Each structure stands twice: as structure tokens, then as C-alpha cells.
Symmetry: D4
Subunit: 219 residues, 8 copies
């Protein structure tokens, strides 16, 4: 398991990460982590590795783009002195291009996205033990749907940043795509973004698998 | 203007027609019509044809399939003694097939849909001046998206029923398709079903055009 | 159509413009525009000219007079860098004279009204592409009702300001007067000011007509 | 003071009488009388005639026409065994004709109104010490405003019924008319019906004057 | 009538004056005056002297003693530039001595009361047209009840201040005492302080009588 | 300790006994007993006699007179099969006479009170181990205050009934009288009826003393 | 995977199973399953076996003992025609004995518990494909804590019933015991019963393991 | 009785002391003291020693540790100029070690606890008349439960501080332990910390006994 005892794991992102977490602190065992994948990861780690003694902080904020992450990075990431930082950002960067196509200042285009995410990862890498970069996703099985096509591009940028910088990488899109071989998007998320428990389990499992979680530990 | 002075026009359907209308009666100038296309239709008819004294009733109920309309048809339609009945149904009949693909009792397949809608029209036709059949719609430009493809099947049946019964006919899908040459669905409805004011306006306008509304009357 | 692609159209006024819009921003497609004529205009433009790509901002504030407009003009109009500004102000300027006749400091009399509205239009004209001046209105068909008589005077001032300055002009009063040939005021607005959907449609149509909107575009 | 010691005085009418009174019973010192003219009458009678021990019941119900009063008359009036009954009805009977001019089943025209009110008086007269008939009113100074003109028609019938049946009589319209020589209606009621404290005071005072209240007793 | 046209009458006091008035402004015809004697006075003046054109402001604050009045006097009285100031203070000054007998810093004893009320009246007298001093009261008919005995003492101080300074004077206690010849306190106020509508009418009438109000104006 | 192990002790009365208890059942450790003297009694019995396993039920209902207790006696008392019944009633029977002196149907005069309370005791006596009769009370030190004077009349009857029936007896008025040598009523209850925690403690203690509670047991 | 395609899996129990599920039906993807282990099970089954089309129903009801399950068994279980039934009951049967040790009618002792649970299994066995019996649990590591000791007694009976009836079997207490080697109970449940997300995950995982879930399928 | 007339007694602590007290002041007879042991102490003192005239202030704050006490000590204790200070702190200092074992900065370990509590007592002792030190507690009868074992250690430190400094001392733990010979913890507190009325009575009695309260004063 990549995460070790006594370490502090900090998740950051948009609504998908927030899921109603306690503001500002985002920390503790009885609801402060919100009700989605971040809480499920913490739950599963505690259920299967109770002894690892990890602290987990949820700094997700509904509505955020990577520009919003940059503006709060000092106080919400650096100042928390985490050991591990998990980032999942891009959904809003992209979605605003499609749901508010004429409010361009709300858009974070690929240049701004790459440059900003790159800069946050580079600044954070030497200060922590590790970084996990999760791709954004869109719950949509047609690669040529325009927003899915853009989201896949943004995930390609996350993947190069995680390779230019050496971070762990979780392709959340590939995790949905597998389920989408069976289910129409609406079965998981009417709006193709905010999913049911099942979607948050897909995310939580995609994360855990990347960090070497075992469902039943061997022995 | 197909609708004559003093006549009663009754809308029925699902949430798109409902839009928070007052239950049970669904009738009045100050909010009982709900906040969507029905209200818009009435508003425009009053703004442009105030002298017509048209009474409008909204019997939409969110969640309904055509099976649900049949169950309340005597009480909600027949007993109201309308002069004109406008039906818009099918969205849920189809949506359940894709969001709850394993709760089949929620689904109304196209055979049942068609016979049931025909039964509503055939019962009602001799009691009214006219019937307006509005197709269901899905705000999705790709004809091959599985739910759009199914929706079009149901809209084709509506069109056939209208032709066969000599009802008026509004192709709501065609109205959306035009706008979807420019806008990505999310700019109109995150969930591809429940739309912005703009979407309700697309509907209202499509209805008004079919009943011979003039934006600036020659009369 | 007077408004062109990529332009930003900013509406300002009192409750009739506000209609519950989102504060402070007043901008976006899913409710931030409020529930009255401003949202209806945006809806109709999107339904019939989806490609025009216009941004619309609602800066209406319930209770305002033109004195209140002046106090927030810098931040709420100039600083938004709009291309088009639509103003509809005067109802409260006048109504306070009649509903609180002894609280004179609440009144904005014709001198203050002309001088202030004039100054806002003159300052704004060189900074934008265009200005739309809408008259205030009172839903009352008797010209000699004292408040209607005063409101018509205030509309005459708006009309000269729009001619001294060259702005588009919408006579909202004349739009109501036509409907009031049929309907008693209470059918549209118990209080002769805050109307039903139908009244907001009268306003929205009066606006659209002035800016050259076509219900069905020719071709 | 027409009302004698130990007697029960029952008010009935629409919202003007109701004013949020406690349902069903409408009786008590600490709020059950509602917050308008009925409460004011009781307050003044207690402040100036505390020894009279007058019991007061408020059976107003907002929305009612005289057709609605007849429907509840046995239960709300007759069964209460009052000594004095005060009726104020007609505002809605008339208002619906102007705000919902095409929902005719809401309207009570003057013929029906008159016979129905006569029926209430004639049934009740032999069971009580007295009846007070208060005219309806419309807070509007122009006699030729269509709704004021209709209202006056109904008030004239009330006055005739009072004369014919030997009931006491309060002309509420005449009380407002006096004040309307100074105030524009809006200063008393935006909607010309539901008034400020001042309007409720105009009513209370008009009632009290008719039952022989003295502001400073010679007794 | 002591109050004249165009004058501004400002009431100040504790809960008995506040009665839920709008904060901070305390001014206007549709609820800002609260629901007790101050609103009733304004209502009766408007009903019987609509032409006097008086402005009325309610600056009452629940919980206040005269020490609290002094701390806000500049902003809430002087800065409002009233023509007439009505003060009714003392209830809490006294009640705290009895309901929280051991929290002495909450008490305003007779020395502090006389000195402070005196100083406010002396400072205000040359800046306004007139001052009305209303005694505090306790709804309790036994002169030897300790709190009633203290309250009567505090009223004696108000009466000398109104004579040392020449102000109008309203003995609210004597107005209650008359009613208390018939009614037990609980019929007017369970807690002997916060009364029913009837109590607020006793107060409103005691005020009006002092300022020369006529119920029916002669002529 | 008169109450034995495993026994059921049932309290009945008005609001003083009720204090927000859970309806209908009024039984449990975590809030169903309400927040006054009953809860305090149970708390102390558990703190000092935990081994007794006493079940306590609270059947107080705010507003009740002894006429109301008789109406629910079979269901609320007899059917519960208690071992001990504690009654406290009379406050309202008397209070209505003074706060609603002209709604006589709310009043229970002393003759009716006495016979009705005797009937409750006489029916219940053979079914239980014991009965505790608590006097009503009025927090008012002057014996000649009309309501205190009446209350004492009713308490004297309670005491006589207890003597005659061999019931236990708690003089709540005597307990208050002692405290009222120091405190003015308002320091315990603004309304002279519903008291602070201290007043509920005065009651609880008076009850406990009568059933032989020891604050520090010799056992 | 013991559960087959198209099958219906029904959970029953107390609050641990309930977790705010939708009443009465307890069925759907978007919240009706509640927010605990049942929801987690469904989420994981959908994330990993989306093609199975398993229908899940949640019939938990907070507060229930096995006596309560028997009372609703025909309606909540039998009439639902499930393929698999999972039962988790006993926590309350035991807890009442310790939190309300003197309200015995709340307690279900082990003899009654065992026969009643056997009756549920024996009735249901011939109607379903399978039964899963989950033990009750108490989050408390000391086997000699009186409530843990009782709980283990009931879990031993569950295990015996499962053996005897050939049901599947989940020892929830053993799953907690493992985690309790590291965590003090409070880190999972202040009250030792209702757990954090982590505790619900411990349960979900224990259930999934017993039905042959694979975290990463070889299929 | 150790507390004397006219003295101010200030209680400080965590939720057990707070119990919903009014913030910031925490002072007065009608609810500001919260609903637990502090209010019960004040009630019993008033019931049995009404003449002592003591003022009581509740400065408890839910969640506090002794580190939190130190941070607010100046404003909430010293600045209130109390005569007597009662402290009960330690529950959270300890509980966080067990319920959030990995959030170490939330823990107040024995060194910090002793040093801080010591310093607050030493600084406060010369400024007041007396100090009461109450041990923290855990409602758990097994001395070897790890949290109970730690809590007893923290109580030993309180006891030495009260002996190093000469303060009164209340062993709240010993008071619970006596009841816990009969009752399982859950009968008093599901979570072993926040108890029922009975638990607050155990605390209130343990306090009162230490300050020499007599249930029935001799004489």
C-alpha cells in the first residue's frame, strides 16, 4: 500500500470530491469527509487497514476549476502540510464551456488548465511524500460526444503532467467506461457528472486500486 | 388562432407540463399553472389575445407515463369538459428504461404506449373541439444516443396517431434539434430532460405556432 | 436584430427587472436572471436566435428609484463593461409619492428624476454600443388616475432623454394600455405594478419588438 | 351602546373580517380574533366598557363570497347562538368579476347576491337581538372606476336590505371616501382591498359609531 | 390637536413601544410601526385626521431601560430630527429589580432613572417642538404590591420631570387602574406588563387624549 | 421511600405536570417525561435509588382542568394500571375565572371541582397502592390577591380530600409561600404560574419529601 | 457471486439496515436504500457487476426487535417475493435490556428471540433461493462487558440457526472484533451501535465476502 | 454552606457544563443557564436557600479541552470577577485520544493537562474567594476500559491540583461509579459521556454535597 502509517492524505477537487464535507476543516471520522468517494476510501482503509493510522482531509469545493484551486492552494494544501495530495479537477473547467458557452471568463481552456495544474503539481511535489493525480471524467460512453471528447483531452494532460512529474495516476474515465459498456449514463448520473453511490464506489475503487489497496490482505 | 373565445384548453403530461402547478385544480392567472411552458403559453395568449377569454387548466403530474395518464383520464380530463386537450407524454415511459433498466414495471414499451395513447385520443376526440399531440423529446443531438433513438421511435408514433386521428401535432424534438445545432444539451438541460426558461420557451413557441398564434396580429 | 453576436446585454431597474435574480452577479442560464421579463427575453432570444451567443446580466434591485441606480451605477453597470444597457426605472420614484405621501425624502420628483436619468444615460452612452430606455408604467387604464397621470409624465421624460441622447425607446405604458382596453387592472396586477406572467410577457414582447426580434425569422 | 352586558357578538365576512383569526372557533382575548378591525373593536370595547363582558367571535374566512357564507351559515352563525351578528360581504363577489373575468363560477352577480344576503338576514333576524350590515368597500375614489362602480351597486343593496329588515347599517365605502379626499388608495391598500392598520381603524371606528360607542363615556 | 401638519412624531421606549417594529428605521405605513399602541395611534390619526400629514417613527427596543435609551439617544432620537418625541420608559428599570433581584447591574435605580431621564429631556427640549412623557406602568391593581409601588414611584419622577421641563404627560398607570377596577390583571396581561390588543388600546387612547385627539371632530 | 421496587408511578395534571412530555405514552429515560418537576423527580429517584426500578409515566396535558382529567381518566390513568397516582390540578380551573372571566364554560367552580376530584380519587383508590394529591398553587404572596385567594380555597379542598381518602398530600402553595418571603413572584414566574427550573425544583422537592425520599440514604 | 442475474435481494433489520431508507418501498438507485451498508453493497455490486441487474430492497426499520420483524414479515418480506433475504436483528432485542432495564416489554430474551428468528427463516426458506443471516453486533472489545456478552449469546444462536437451516451466515461481531484490536469503540461508534462510514463499510464488506463478491473479478 | 450571600459563582467546562447555555453571557434565571447540572444546582439553591442571593454564570462550551479554557480564561473567567469558580474539564482532553486517535493535535495529553489546569488554578486562586475542581468522568464501570482508566488518571491530577492549591474537590467519577453498581452505562448515557436528567442530577448532587448544601436545613 503506497500510503503508510501516520501519514496525512489530503484530497482536493470540485463537488465530486467535496460531497458536503465540513468547511473549512474537512477533517474527521463522523461526517466531515462528505458523503462520496473520499469518505468511502477512508472507510475502506479503516475497515481493512485500521492500524495504518492515516489522517484524511477533504478540501473539495463544489464549483471549482483549477483556477480556483490555484487561488486557495496555499491555505488549503501547502499550509495543511500533507504527506499525500490527491487532485481531481477538470470537470468544471470543461463543463462551463458547454453549459455556459457564452460566459467565456468562466471557461478554463486547455492552455490555462495544463499550465496551472502543472504549476501546482511542481510546486507541491518537493513538499510532500507523494501526489495522486486523478483525471476528470464525464459519464458518457460516446467518445465523440463533444464534452466527453474534451474531457478525454483534459485527462491526457493530467496523464502527461503525472508522467512529466512522476505522480500516481488514476484514470477515472477508464473506470466509468467499463461500466458504461452495460449501463446508460442516466443509470449512474442524470447529468453525466454527479453520480449515485455506485459512481462514487467506481471512483473510490479506482483510487484504492492505484494505491495498492487489497480487499483481503495476504497473508 | 385555432382556439376560440370562451373555450377551455387543458394541458396534460409529466413534469415538463406540471412545473409545480397547483394541485388538484391547476387553474388561475397568479401561479396555479406552474412556471414552464404552459404558463408561458397562457401569458402570451393573454398578452396578444386578451379578448379571447380562454380558460386554461394544467393537469401535468411529474413522473407520469402514459399508463399513469390513462389511470387518471376520466377524472383529470373527461370530467373537466375541455374544448381542447394538449397531451405531452412519453419522456418517462422511455427514461425509466435507461435510468432504472432493471425496474421493468416502471417502463412502458412502445407497443403498450401506442395503444394506450390511441385509447386516450379515441375516447376524447368525440367530446372536444380538438386535440393537440405534442411529441416527447430528449435534448440530445446524436440520433444514435440510445435514449434519443428510443425517444424518436415514440415521437414517430405520436405523429402517426395525430395523422390518423386528425389531431393537431407539435414535434418538440424537431424544435430542439434546431437549437441543438448550436447549443450542447447541457446549455439547455443538464439532465437532457428538464430545461431552462429557454427550453420552456422553445416548447411554448412550438405549441403556439401549431395553434396559429401570431406574434403581431394582422387583426 | 439590434443586438449582435457575442454582445453583453445588461438590464437594470427595480423589482420589475429584478424578479428574484441572483445577487450580486445576476448572470447565467439556470435561474440567476429571475423569473420575469428579463428571463423571458433571454429565453426567447435563445429559442429563436441560439447562435447569437449573447450574454445577459440582470442588475435589477427591488425598491430602487433612479437615485438608487446612480449610487450603484459604477459597480453594477460601468464595471460590467456591457455592450448594451437596458434601463427601466421610475415606478418607485413615482409610487412613493402616492403610497408614502408624507415621507418626502423617499420621493424622487421630476426634477431629480430627469436630471439623474439624463446624467446616467449621458455618462453611459459613449462607453457602450447601445442603450435601451424603457418607460416606467402603471397598470391602470384611466389617464386621469393621479398616479397613472404622473407615471405618464415620467415616461415623457424618458422619451425625451432617449431622443436628446439617441437611445432605443420602449413605451411599456402603451403596451399595457392596449391590453387594458380589455382587462381590468386586477386581472394583470392586484397592485397595478407587479404583474402576472402575462404582464411580464407584455414587457418582454415590448422589448423584443423594439430590438427587431422576429418570432419566425425570414427566410 | 347597543350591545348589552353578557351578550355575544359574532362577526362574519371575508379576509377583511378574518385577518388570520383562529380556526374554527375564532374566540378569545390573546390573538384568536385576528389582527384587524374585529380585534380593534374588541380592544376598544374592553378599554372603554370593560364591565360589559361582551363575548366576541370572529367567523371571517378569507376568499368568501356571500354564496360561501350561506354554505356555512347554520354551523358558523346559527349554531353559535349569537345575540348580534355583523356581516361584511361582497368584496370578493365583485372582485372576481374583475381579476378572473373568465372564471364565472367565482362571480356572484348582484341579483343572486341580494337574494342570498336577504336570506341570511331573514333567517337570522328572529334568532338574535340585532344585525349589523356592513357594506363591502373598494378603496378607490373614482366612482366610475369599473370595480368601484360595481361595488357601490352592491353597497346600495346592503343599505336597502338594512332599511327593509330594520338592521343596523355601516357604510364602509362612505368612511373610506372621506379619507380618499386626502389619500391616494395606495397609501391605504396597494391592492385597493386589504388595508393598513389605518384602514382597519377606519372600519372599526365606523362599526363602533353605528353601535353607539362613546370614546369618553358620559356614564 | 397638539401635533400639526407635516410634523414628525418619534416614539421611543422598550418592548411596549417596539412591538416588533422594523429595525433600524422604524418608519412607514405597512408594518414597520409594530403591532401595538404606536401603530394604533398612527392608525387612528390617519383615520380621523388624514390631512394632517404626520410622519411617525418607532424607535422602541425590547429590553431597554433608560440607560439603554441614553446610549442610543444621539443616533435614534437627535439624528432623526423629530418634531415631537414621545418617551415611555421605566418598566424594565423597575422589573429587573424584581425578576433578577441579584443581578444588580441590570437594575436602574431611582437615582439613575431620574438623573438620566431628566438629562435626555433637557437635552432634547430645545431641539424639538414638543416632548410627550408617558409613565411606565404595571398591570396590577394593588398599590402595595411591591413592584406596582415602585412603578408608581418611577411615574412620580416622570411627572416631576414633565413639570420641571414643561412636557406633555400621560399617566398610563391611571388608565390601567380604571380598567383594573373591573378586570383582574391576567385578563389583560398574564405577566402584568405585555398586554393584549385591549391594553394597547388603553395606551393608545391615553396618548391620544393627551394630545387633544377627537374621536369625532367638531364641527 | 413509600414507592416500592418495580412499581409504576403515574403523574397527571396540567402544563406544570406536562412540560412538553411525549404524547401519548409519556414514558422513558431520555426526554419523554418533559423538562419539569416530573423529570426532576425521576432523575433524583434514579440518582439516589437506582435499584428501585420505578417506572414513571407522565400524563400531564397543558390547559387541563379537573373536568378534562375526568374525561380522559379511564384511558390515561385506569388503563395504565399504575401503583401510585399523583394528581396536580386546579390551576386552570381557577385561572380561567380570572383571565377569561366572561367565557364561563372554561371555568370549573369549586363545588364541581371538589366533587369531580373526589370522584377521581374514589374510583382510583381501590386499584392502586397509593395516591398523592398535590395542591394547585399560585406564585403570589398576597393572600388577598383575588386569584391567590381562590387558589387557596381549592387547595384547602384538596387537603380535605386527601385527609378523607387517606391519600398522601403535598401542599405546593405552602412550599412556594416560604420562598415568596424572599423572592417577588416574577423572579420565579412572570405569569405567576409557569416557573423557572427553581420553581420546578420547589415542586419536585415537595413531592419527594412527601414520599419519604432521603437526599443521603441511611440505607 | 451467489446472487444471480435479475434476482431480487431484500434486506431487513433495524436502524443499521434502515439508515434513512425510503418508506415504504425502500427501492431505487438515487437514495431510497438509505446511506449505510445496504447502499454500499448495492454500490459495489453495481460498480463491479453492473450486468447482473440485481434488484435490491431495503426493509430496515429503526428500533425493531425480532418481534417487530415477525409482525411485518408477510407484508415486508413475503409479499415482496424476493430471491434472497438478508436478516440482521438482535441489537435492540438486547440493547433495551441494558438502556431500559425496567421497561421489560421492550426486551426480547434469547429464548423468544431464537424461536422467533427460526420461525422467520423456516417460513421463508421454501419461498426463496437463499437466506443470509447476519449476526447482531456490539462495538465493544471486552467480551465480559455485560452487553457484549449478551450480544455474543444472540450471535451464537444466529450461527446455529444458519447451520441448521443451511442459510448463508455473516459474523458481524467477528468483523468488528478484528478492527477493535486497533481502535477503541468510540472511534467507530460513540454509542457502540450506530457506526461511522467505516463501520458500515466493515458490514458491507463482511456481507459481500459471504456472497462471493470479488473486488477484481477473474471473469 | 460554603457559598455565601451576594456571591457570584461561575461554572466553566465543556458540553456537560454548557448544556445549551446562552452565549456569551451565560447568566440569568429563565434558561440562560442551560438545561443540565448547572441549572439544577441553581434551582436547588434557590429552592432551599432563596435568601442567599447568589449570582450564577455558566461559561461552559461544548467541545472544549483545558487548552480551550486557557485561550478564553481572561475574558470568560477573570473579567467576570467571580467569587467562586467551578471547573470541570478533561472529558474531551481524553475522549479525542480515543475517538480520533490519529488526529494528535486534538489530544491534550496528561502533561499538557496538568500543566495547563495547574496554571489556571494558580492564577485564579488569589483573585477569588474560592475554587471548586470537579473531576472529569466517564460513565463506564470497568476500571480497565482504556478510556475509563485514562479518565481516572486525569481525575487524579485534578485531585492533586486541588490539594497542591487547596481547592474544593468533587469526584464526579465516584458519584457515577455508585450508580453503575446497578445500572449499565447505556441507561444513563448511550455514549458514556452525555447523560440523561438522572446523570445531571448525580452531578448536581455531587457538587451540592461538596459545598455543604442541606436538602432540609437544620433547624
Amino acid at each position: 500500500m503506497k500510503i503508510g502509517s501516520g501519514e496525512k492524505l489530503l484530497f482536493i477537487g470540485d463537488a465530486i470530491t467535496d460531497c458536503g464535507r465540513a468547511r473549512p476543516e474537512g477533517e474527521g471520522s463522523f461526517g466531515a469527509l462528505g458523503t462520496g468517494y473520499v469518505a468511502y476510501v477512508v472507510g475502506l482503509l479503516q475497515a481493512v487497514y485500521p492500524e495504518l493510522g492515516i489522517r484524511v482531509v477533504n478540501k473539495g469545493i463544489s464549483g471549482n476549476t483549477v483556477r480556483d484551486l490555484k487561488a486557495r492552494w496555499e491555505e488549503d494544501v501547502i499550509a495543511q502540510k500533507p504527506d499525500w495530495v490527491s487532485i481531481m479537477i477538470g470537470i468544471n473547467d470543461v463543463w462551463r464551456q458547454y453549459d455556459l458557452p457564452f460566459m467565456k471568463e468562466k471557461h478554463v481552456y486547455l492552455d490555462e488548465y495544463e499550465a496551472t495544474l502543472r504549476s501546482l503539481v511542481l510546486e507541491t511535489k518537493p513538499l510532500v511524500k507523494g501526489i495522486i493525480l486523478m483525471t476528470p471524467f464525464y459519464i458518457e460512453g460516446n467518445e465523440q460526444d463533444p464534452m466527453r471528447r474534451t474531457m478525454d483531452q483534459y485527462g491526457r494532460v493530467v496523464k502527461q503532467i503525472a508522467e512529466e512529474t512522476n505522480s500516481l495516476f488514476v484514470d477515472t474515465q477508464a473506470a466509468f467506461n467499463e461500466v458504461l459498456k452495460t449501463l446508460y449514463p442516466a443509470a449512474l448520473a442524470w447529468d453525466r457528472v454527479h453520480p449515485s453511490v455506485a459512481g462514487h464506489m467506481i471512483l473510490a475503487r479506482a483510487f484504492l486500486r492505484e494505491i495498492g489497496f487489497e480487499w483481503v490482505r495476504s497473508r
